[PDB]
Amino acid sequence: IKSALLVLEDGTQFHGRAIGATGSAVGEVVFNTSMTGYQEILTDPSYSRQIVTLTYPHIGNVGTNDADEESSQVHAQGLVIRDLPLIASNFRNTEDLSSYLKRHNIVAIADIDTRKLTRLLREKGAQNGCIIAGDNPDAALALEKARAFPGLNGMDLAKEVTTAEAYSWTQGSWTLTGGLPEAKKEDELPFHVVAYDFGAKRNILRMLVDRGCRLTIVPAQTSAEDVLKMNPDGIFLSNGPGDPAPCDYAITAIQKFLETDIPVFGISLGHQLLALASGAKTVKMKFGHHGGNHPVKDVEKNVVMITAQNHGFAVDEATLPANLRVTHKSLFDGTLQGIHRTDKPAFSFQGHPEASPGPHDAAPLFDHFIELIEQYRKT
């Protein structure tokens, strides 16, 4: 028998089985409703310091593989599931879930009532928690660790996951037939985009490459001055963990960009960051949006899109500057989902146009960003 235990800040206990590394894990606890894409989810840097509970009972049905990694490592702090399948069954698999977790040194627990946990988080709101996996899991210790967690509000995590030094990205999207492409050649990409790495997902980069952008991935703290020096065709603000709020450096730099005519586009954290620099305020949601079936209306066109969501903070629509027009809203809760600067070539989306995992409905968000870029090169 391999025990494991999960304890919430409020004292709630969940007893299960250890399916990953031996040890302890602490972080904010969340639930994601994605029936597929667990690997992608686990490898999302945005999940840094969060303990991920999956609502879909059977997690690991397809094992894992490299192409399904959205970053170089597993960023989730811990994984909480209802059931770990006996086997992985998919031509794409290269290593079973449990093995993968152990490899990445992830504390994970299975066999617990994830529905009870979900309903609790929904009703009471997010909560920090601690998973302990080992011979005899100390429930009082776990509760200690959880209660001591500083929490995500006001925590800059973007500076934690970002890249140390700048680098290039010219690799495109995966294909069933060919797999993951060989990185393009610089001369094979018309546009040059500078992307701020706030803990950026690979799919965003790949997709941008798919649309003809050669990329320069820059550390979160990179000054606007340094960027501007590279003569960007466009500036992109990646997704990532924590509160956008405390990221002074980014906001500052962005404001700078906003003085210029360089097109700016941001996704999730980048949306937030954009809104902040534009003088809007960001709030911490009760429980957030974590899943792949979230309806978002494009208010302009009056069309709905099924989207992939992964965020705990939002832009207050009621503090939006007049220079910030609303472009999309959640059909689930009415929360702000998109904005466009009425006076600048800058826009952002709260959701994940790049999906991975999730529906491709929002990818056209990218196209607009290309538009701007094309136009900008016109001038």
Binding site: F31, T33, S34, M35, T36, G37, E40, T55, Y56, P57, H58, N61, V62, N65, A67, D68, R82, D83, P85, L86, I87, S89, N90, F91, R92, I112, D113, T114, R115, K116, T118, R119, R122, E123, W174, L176, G291, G292, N293, H294, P295, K297, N302, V303, V304, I306, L331, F332, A355, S356, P357, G358, P359, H360
Partner: protein
């Protein structure tokens, strides 16, 4: 946009009688469509020949037409009703075909009827397999290598091209009707010929084999604003080669990576976009090569289906309801999500935090001569569904709720049978209905997962899970009840193990396992369905049991509860009729102020529609499952008399476990069902009952037979023996012995007793004589030949029985009238399959009424005391599945084989009969040549019939014997040769289409087996034939009438009642 305003009236095309492949799911959907459109203030007109439908309830729509679903009749309705639009997407294939004929016949144009939900062109683009393939090619999706065929010659050429095995699929058919897998030229020609004739467009698509590939389905929804969503994904347990409907399926998809799932997702949307479905749902099927994820599109159904119903039940998203509204202008974003309190929109993709399993239900045992192997043509007669927090749990629950005597993975072959592995191997390689059970036996026998995979092609992901169960079963067996500690037993329950199964392994009674659970305080919790993996709260109470931590039941303490037990999956003899009764109970008592609880797990039905009851428990209808619910609900009363056999068989145990069963007691029922207790009551009442004996040995019965008299009725399955020699005979191949009442009129009588009075609901006179099961006979209400005198006796006899037995609620009695003498066949102290028919002809909602009675409100109190006799004739006719199982002799007998029924309304019996006949899809014509071939006893009566046919302008043919008798009467038919006689014989003539009518009556195990060719040929060439003289006289009467002459609504019918 919001609702359309250019449309005020909508005509909905219903599905007609239930058949294999086109079942209950269409009453559920048509009921949801009607309710949705009526909710939105539209004028609802619908046509459906099946009377046992909730959708035809008078109060459900404005103008309800229980008329034959034939374009000419519909034309009448249209003419008369002048609908602004027609919704053809809620009645299976019948609806699709009919809307397209109406269109082709220029009827839609004639009456300016607008086609909503889907356009004629989109329906064709999907139904026409040739067009479908093109469309795919256009959008760059892949389909298997195929060829279109319009003739055999054409067909043979494609075959030559794709090689064997090859799959044959007709255009304009579903449920695999007219199709199959050809493994050779012989099989091939057989199938194609059948398929070519069946196809409304005379077209076949022949494809190369993808047998063994994974099979998937997606349920999609699209609106006029181009918003589109995936409501549900389905992964088939049984691979490609076995029809989705004859397969075990699960939601959601299990083995697709996110990347593959998105491709599939994208493709499904593109399919609908290309076919042109912009305001509704569609089902899209695929095949996936497990080795490389290669995606192939199979087909698409531009309507609601069995899978959309499974899907609605699985996610809690009412697809049909939504789709109805979309048909009239609404967009997804404008509608609200029912289950989440309408706090969220219909424009979203559901997420489920559990596993849904569906297992098909078969009835091979009823089709002795049938090929019982599963193929591309559906042979299932029903289905069960189960929800569990895990697959193991989900699967096991489905198994024990299948109503086949299974408690889970019960063995089929013994461990010490040296021949075991051979049988097991066969059962895995070539799947029959028992395969699921053979799979565990394989693991029990030493077969590996890989071993089993190579034979079945069922994903290892599922296999490894079954094996685990087996191994656990092995431990239980080993440790015995002693090793069943609280920890282990909990693990077991979490895996979905039934007490009954554990009981067997441990070698104890089931109550012992259950005792143990009560001791450990080991009970399940109930989770709720919410479409959103608990991301939002719900106000609906749609639950399932599971062994977890938190319980969401939260029973009320507030009201008086009434529980209603359903019948699980439908089977022959246990259909929709019972469900209908179950629904009515719920609706009635709910309206009266009770808190209604529905317990059932049939995904196809209206009973498992969350709107039908206050609280729905989608559970196995077993003693274990039901006691757990009672345990926490603590109902006031439980009805076990309305879901058929399933709930009836539980009554005693329930009562004894302390369940407050209401209505007719378990014991009373027992009194009636038990041959002995009954013979005793009948005796006591001084009533007439056929001579009977209870033989133990052969020679014993020969003697006793002598006593009783031939012909004899031998009840263990049921046969009729004629002579001593005939008795042995049976005995070989082969116990109640009863004298068979020859040339007797059968009658059904449905009634209600409140212990104070007896209300006669309806006396039905069967067309077919006693000996042809009531369930397979046409019948008339009111009687069309019986005397008022004789009817009164029965009525009196009913009343006697009613009180004697202590009936409280419904009852049905079966009589036989021989020589102006009334004989009692049996008593059914419960709701009978005829209840819905009677309620519709008479206008009295018998089920409702009896429900109220069971609940305490006397007939007098309800004001339902006088027997109704309608001012019209109502005729019920059935539909048999013989076309699905060709190797079977399509002949009537004492065993019920029909799957559905229709109703015919007329000012005259003949007019009623003609409507019912046409409705049953008969191919009868009002001219041509008839073929007479009857048996001895009929020889006398056949002359008049021949004369009748002659009067009608028909030319006659006959076989020797028959020719003799007619000749001696002054009627010279054209002699025709039996098959052993020479040429040409009946067979040849039938095949060349020489006949438009056939009357062929037989009597004797030999005479039957001899004449088998006449019936098989008649069926195959589409010639209406009657296997009873009585049947033939009705058909004859009906020739005088015009089914298309006049149409009447149920509302109007009802209004005619005094």
């Amino acid at each position: 946009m919001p609702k359309r305003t250019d449309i005020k009236s909508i005509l909905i095309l219903g599905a007609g009688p239930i058949v294999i492949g086109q079942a209950c799911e269409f009453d559920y959907s048509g009921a949801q469509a009607c309710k949705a459109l009526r909710e939105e203030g539209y004028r609802v007109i619908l046509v459906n020949s099946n009377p046992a439908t909730i959708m035809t309830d008078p109060e459900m729509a404005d103008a309800t037409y229980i008329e034959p679903i034939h374009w000419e009749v519909v034309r009448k309705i249209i003419e008369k009703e002048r609908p602004d639009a027609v919704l053809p997407t809620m009645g299976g294939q019948t609806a699709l075909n009919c809307a397209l004929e109406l269109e082709r016949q220029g009827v839609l144009e004639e009456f300016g009827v607008t086609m909503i939900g889907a356009t004629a062109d989109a329906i064709d683009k999907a139904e026409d397999r040739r067009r479908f393939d093109v469309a795919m090619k256009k959008i760059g999706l892949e389909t298997a290598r195929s060829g279109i065929a319009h003739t055999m010659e054409e067909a043979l050429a494609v075959a030559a091209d794709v090689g064997f095995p090859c799959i044959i699929r007709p255009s304009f058919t579903m449920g695999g009707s007219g199709g199959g897998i050809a493994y050779n030229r012989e099989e091939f020609e057989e199938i194609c010929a059948r398929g070519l004739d069946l196809s409304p467009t005379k077209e076949l698509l022949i494809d190369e084999s993808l047998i063994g590939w994974k099979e998937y389905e997606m349920e999609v929804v699209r609106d006029k604003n181009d918003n589109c969503i995936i409501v549900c994904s389905i992964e088939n347990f049984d691979a490609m080669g076995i029809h989705t409907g004859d397969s075990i399926t699960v939601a959601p998809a299990q083995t697709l990576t996110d990347k593959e799932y998105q491709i599939m997702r994208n493709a499904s949307m593109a399919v609908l976009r290309e076919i042109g479905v912009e305001t509704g749902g569609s089902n899209v099927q695929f095949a996936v090569n497990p080795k490389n994820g290669r995606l192939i599109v199979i087909e698409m159904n531009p309507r609601v289906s069995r899978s959309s119903a499974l899907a609605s039940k699985a996610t809690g998203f009412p697809i049909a309801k939504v789709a109805a509204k979309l048909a009239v202008g609404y967009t997804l974003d404008e509608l609200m999500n029912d289950i989440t309190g309408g706090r969220t929109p219909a424009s979203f993709e559901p997420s489920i935090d559990y596993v849904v399993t569906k297992i098909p239900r078969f009835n091979f045992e009823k089709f002795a001569g049938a090929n019982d192997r599963l193929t591309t043509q559906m042979k299932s007669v029903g289905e069960v569904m189960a929800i569990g927090r895990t697959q193991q749990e989900s699967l096991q629950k489905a198994l024990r709720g299948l109503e086949v005597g299974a408690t889970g993975f019960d063995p089929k072959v013994s461990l010490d049978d040296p021949e075991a592995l051979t049988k097991i191997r066969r059962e895995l390689k070539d799947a029959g209905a028992d395969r699921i059970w053979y799979i565990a036996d394989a693991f029990r026998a030493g077969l590996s997962v890989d071993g089993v995979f190579n034979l079945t092609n069922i994903d290892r992901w599922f296999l490894v899970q079954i094996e685990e169960l087996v191994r656990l079963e092995e431990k239980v067996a080993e440790v015995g009840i002693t090793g069943l500690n609280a920890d282990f037993l909990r693990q077991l329950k979490r895996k979905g193990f039934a007490d009954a199964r554990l009981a067997k392994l441990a070698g104890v009674r089931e109550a012992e396992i259950r005792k143990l659970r009560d001791q450990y305080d080991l009970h399940p919790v109930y989770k709720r369905v919410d479409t959103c993996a608990a991301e939002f709260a719900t106000d609906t109470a749609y639950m399932y049991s599971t062994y977890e931590e938190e319980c969401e039941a939260n029973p009320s303490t507030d009201r008086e509860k009434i529980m209603v037990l359903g019948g699980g999956p439908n089977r022959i003899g246990q259909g929709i009729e019972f469900d209908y009764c179950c629904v009515h109970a719920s609706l009635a008592l709910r309206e009266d102020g009770y808190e209604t609880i529905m317990v059932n797990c049939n995904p196809e039905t209206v009973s498992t529609d969350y709107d039908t009851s206050d609280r729905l428990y989608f559970e196995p209808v077993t003693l274990e499952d039901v006691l757990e619910i009672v345990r926490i609900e603590k109902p006031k009363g439980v009805i076990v008399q309305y879901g058929g056999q399933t709930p009836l068989k539980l009554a005693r145990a329930l009562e004894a476990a302390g369940v407050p069963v209401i209505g007719t007691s378990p014991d009373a029922i027992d009194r009636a069902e038990d041959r002995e207790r009954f013979q005793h009551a009948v005796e006591r009442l001084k009533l007439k009952q056929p001579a009977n004996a209870t033989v133990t040995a052969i020679e014993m019965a020969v003697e006793k037979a002598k006593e009783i008299g031939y012909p004899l009725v031998v009840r263990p399955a049921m046969e009729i023996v004629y002579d001593e020699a005939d008795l042995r005979r049976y005995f070989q191949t082969a116990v109640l012995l009863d004298h068979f009442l020859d040339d007797a009129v059968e009658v059904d009588v449905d009634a209600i007793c409140d212990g104070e009075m007896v209300l006669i609901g309806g006396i039905m006179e069967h067309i077919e004589q006693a000996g042809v099961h009531s369930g397979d006979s046409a019948c008339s209400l009111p009687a069309y030949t019986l005397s008022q005198e004789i009817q009164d006796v029965m009525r009196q006899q009913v009343q006697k029985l009613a009180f004697e037995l202590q009936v409280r609620g419904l009852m049905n009695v079966q009589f036989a009238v021989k020589n102006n003498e009334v004989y009692l066949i049996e008593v059914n102290p419960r709701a009978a399959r005829t209840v819905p028919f009677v309620s519709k002809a008479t206008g009295v909602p018998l089920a409702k009424v009896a429900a109220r009675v069971m609940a305490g409100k006397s007939l007098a109190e309800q004001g339902v005391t006088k027997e109704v006799i309608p001012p019209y004739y109502s005729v019920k006719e059935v539909v048999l599945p013989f076309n699905k199982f060709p190797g079977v002799d399509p002949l009537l007998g004492p065993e019920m084989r029909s799957t559905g029924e229709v109703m015919g309304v007329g000012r005259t019996f003949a007019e009623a009969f003609a409507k019912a006949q046409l409705g049953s899809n008969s191919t009868m014509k009002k001219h041509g040549r008839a073929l007479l071939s009857v048996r001895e006893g009929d020889k006398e009566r056949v002359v008049d019939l021949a004369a009748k046919l002659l009067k009608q302008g028909f030319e006659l043919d006959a076989t020797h014997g028959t020719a003799i008798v007619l000749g001696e009467a002054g009627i010279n038919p054209r002699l025709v040769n039996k098959v052993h006689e020479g040429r040409p014989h009946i067979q040849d003539r039938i095949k060349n289409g020489e006949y438009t009518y056939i009357i062929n009556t037989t009597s004797g195990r030999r005479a039957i087996e001899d004449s088998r060719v006449i019936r098989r040929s008649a069926l195959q060439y589409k010639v209406h034939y009657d296997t009873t003289l009585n049947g033939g006289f009705a058909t004859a009467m009906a020739l005088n009438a015009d089914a298309t002459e006049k149409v009447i609504s149920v509302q109007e019918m009802h209004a005619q009642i005094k």
